[PDB]
Swiss-Prot record:
Interacts with YAP1 and WWTR1/TAZ. GO terms for cellular component: chromatin; cytosol; intracellular membrane-bounded organelle; nucleoplasm; nucleus; TEAD-YAP complex; transcription regulator complex. Residues 1-193 are annotated as: Transcriptional activation. It comes from Homo sapiens (Human). Transcription factor which plays a key role in the Hippo signaling pathway, a pathway involved in organ size control and tumor suppression by restricting proliferation and promoting apoptosis. The core of this pathway is composed of a kinase cascade wherein MST1/MST2, in complex with its regulatory protein SAV1, phosphorylates and activates LATS1/2 in complex with its regulatory protein MOB1, which in turn phosphorylates and inactivates YAP1 oncoprotein and WWTR1/TAZ. It is found in: Nucleus. Its main location: nucleus. GO terms for molecular function: disordered domain specific binding; DNA-binding transcription factor activity; DNA-binding transcription factor activity, RNA polymerase II-specific; RNA polymerase II cis-regulatory region sequence-specific DNA binding; sequence-specific double-stranded DNA binding; transcription coactivator binding. One of its GO terms (biological process) is positive regulation of DNA-templated transcription. This is Transcriptional enhancer factor TEF-4. Keywords: Activator, DNA-binding, Nucleus, Transcription, Transcription regulation. The keyword Amino-acid biosynthesis does not apply. It comes from the Eukaryota.
Length: 193
């Protein structure tokens, strides 16, 4: 369960269309030390270090993906939900070799549905950098080469209460490549210290 009392992730996927092909997908708990991965994110400000210091720790998660790169419109879809009416700020930092190369900030207001509030950020066009990176990563002859390249590639997703500036969720994404026989997969972890 990737979430807290105030906010949970319902679904998340990154895909390409001409049906959809999902490179990664979450639809709806072990632990990992944050110390392990200060290096793969920015550090001197707004880093994983600074954010985890502020807390709360229970809002910090790690997701390892094994992506399916064997298959247009390149999109990302995400959905959150909560019991409180809120307006969310969703920040996404793509990092290469610890350095931020993309920051994407989006806003989504609560939508009342079935006795709860949903937050649907759907078919958001995948940024030009990742589309370009993806088509290159595709070219590689071996999976072990893809994994070598990917071990210096991470994403940091921060979801804050726009109105109260409070952190609701912080997710760290790291990536490997799966085979065709073994579909896309994910393993969600809890960040601790
Ligand atoms: O994390 C987010 C939030 S959305 C966004 N921010 N900028 C653009 N889009 N999206 C996300 C996630 C994962 C992937 C990728 C990364 C590797 C592995 C696999 C195939 C491709 C290469 C693409 C999954 C792209 C995007």
């Amino acid at each position: 369960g990737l979430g807290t009392a105030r906010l949970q992730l319902v679904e998340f996927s990154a895909f390409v269309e001409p049906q959809r092909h999902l490179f990664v997908h979450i639809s709806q708990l072990e632990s990992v030390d944050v110390r392990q991965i200060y290096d793969k994110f920015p550090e001197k400000k707004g880093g994983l270090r600074e954010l985890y210091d502020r807390g709360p720790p229970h809002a910090f998660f790690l997701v390892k993906f094994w992506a399916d790169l064997n298959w247009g419109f390149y999109g990302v879809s995400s959905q959150y939900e909560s019991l409180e009416h809120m307006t969310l700020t969703c920040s996404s930092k793509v990092c290469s070799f610890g350095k931020q190369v993309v920051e994407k900030v989006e806003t989504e207001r609560a939508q009342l549905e079935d006795g709860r509030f949903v937050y649907r950020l759907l078919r958001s066009p995948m940024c030009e950098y990742l589309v370009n990176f993806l088509h290159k990563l595709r070219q590689l002859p071996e999976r072990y080469m893809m994994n070598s390249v990917l071990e210096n590639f991470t994403i940091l997703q921060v979801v804050t209460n726009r109105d109260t500036q409070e952190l609701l969720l912080c997710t760290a994404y790291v990536f490997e490549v799966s085979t065709s026989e073994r579909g896309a997969q994910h393993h969600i972890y809890r960040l601790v210290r």
